[PDB]
């Protein structure tokens, strides 16, 4: 509403898959940095049943204006269709860090 | 003001977190709850510096369901005033956002 | 957005540093609470190689009003010139928790 930069969260099934997508996304300079956490548990339902995946969390720091491309790359590379993939607004931070994200970006 | 929220919260151990996540998703109040591995919280209680081990939770949900998610989690939580904070979702993969929406009846 | 309170994400090169900065933050009463997670893997470019460091993740919960001092403190204690340090807006939560945050920052 509308922020210059975005914090994206996702998960991969797997930490090798997370790594592949991560590095792709950094080589291409679509994201300045991707963080891959240690395994999380996701509880959801499908669709009358309560489900329990063991997953790998990813945080993507980026420019909003690069969002559609990142979405496309990540989701294309992800084994599921309909992966967790959500964005929250970056609303401030250390200026020179914020500017690095911006400078690194292929705009 | 967003259609959807990312909620951060903390439980004292994995067992209480998992049984709160299950409730919240059985109740169709959250589409998905993520439980992380343990996490060190540092905070001041007696004007003294404390260190609890906790498990972190992320809840993806519709803003409209927030009051119920709040109460559910807070009543079930052992602490009087636990950590519970809302963050805006302002984008994502459409079919994923849609699956969150579809999944609350309201 | 212009929120009362922020969620800040940041990162330290190891847990001892995270602890040291956490402690400072909490004993200065700049942040009511600070969360140090278990290691994460950060992927980013430097000198146009693809790097991955293991890092310790931090969440800071605070009043937007304290922000300038938190940034100042965290950035200067951090060993890198340009640490990861971003804020996202808190737009809601358990009233008495947000209060507690509000009350723990001396006025």
Residue numbers in the entry:
A (entry chain C), C (entry chain B): 2 to 108
B (entry chain A): 3 to 108
What does the published report state?
CutA1 is universally distributed in bacteria, plants and animals. CutA1 from Escherichia coli (Ec-CutA1) is related to the copper-tolerance mechanism. CutA1 from Homo sapiens (Hs-CutA1) appears to be necessary for the localization of acetylcholinesterase at the cell surface. The functions of CutA1, however, have not been well clarified. It is known that CutA1s from Pyrococcus horikoshii, Thermus thermophilus and Oryza sativa unfold at temperatures remarkably higher than the growth temperatures of the host organisms.
In this work the crystal structure of CutA1 from the psychrotrophic bacterium Shewanella sp. SIB1 (SIB1–CutA1) in a trimeric form was determined at 2.7 Å resolution. This is the first crystal structure of a psychrotrophic CutA1. The intertwined interactions among β strands of SIB1–CutA1 seem to stabilize the trimeric structure as in other CutA1 proteins. Furthermore, we found that the subunits in the trimer are firmly locked to each other with the highly conserved aromatic residues, such as Tyr45, Trp47, Tyr81, Tyr98 and Trp101, in SIB1–CutA1. A thermal denaturation experiment revealed that SIB1–CutA1 does not unfold completely at 363 K at pH 7.0, although Shewanella sp. SIB1 cannot grow at temperatures exceeding 303 K. These results indicate that the trimeric structural motif of CutA1 is the critical factor in its unusually high stability and suggest that CutA1 needs to maintain its high stability in order to function, even in psychrotrophs.
